[PDB]
A = this chain, B = another copy of it.
Amino acid sequence: DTPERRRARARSQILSLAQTLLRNHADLDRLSAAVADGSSDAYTAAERLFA
């Protein structure tokens, strides 16, 4: 009902959907190869998944 509650429900729904989008992200394959071959660290790589 309240703005806090309705926005908390929306946040949980967004995050739930986003978990799957993250696991299935089309750049994970290439970023993982970049971390494994030493051209990037995993923190920088993880940041590059996001807008």
A14 x B31 contact (CB < 8 A): yes
A32-B10, A36-B7 known; A27 vs B51 contact (CB < 8 Å): yes
Q: Write out, one digit per residue, whether chain A residues 1-24 have a CB within 8 A of any chain B CB (1) or not (0).
A: 001001111110111011101110
Q: How far is the CB of A4 from chain B (nearest CB, A)?
A: 10
B14 x A45 contact (CB < 8 A): yes
B50 x A48 contact (CB < 8 A): no
B25 x A13 contact (CB < 8 A): no
B10 x A36 contact (CB < 8 A): yes
With most chain B CB atoms within 10 A of its CB, the pick from A19, A31, A43, A51 is A51
**Roughly how many angstroms separate A43 CA and B21 CA in the complex, as a whole number?**
10
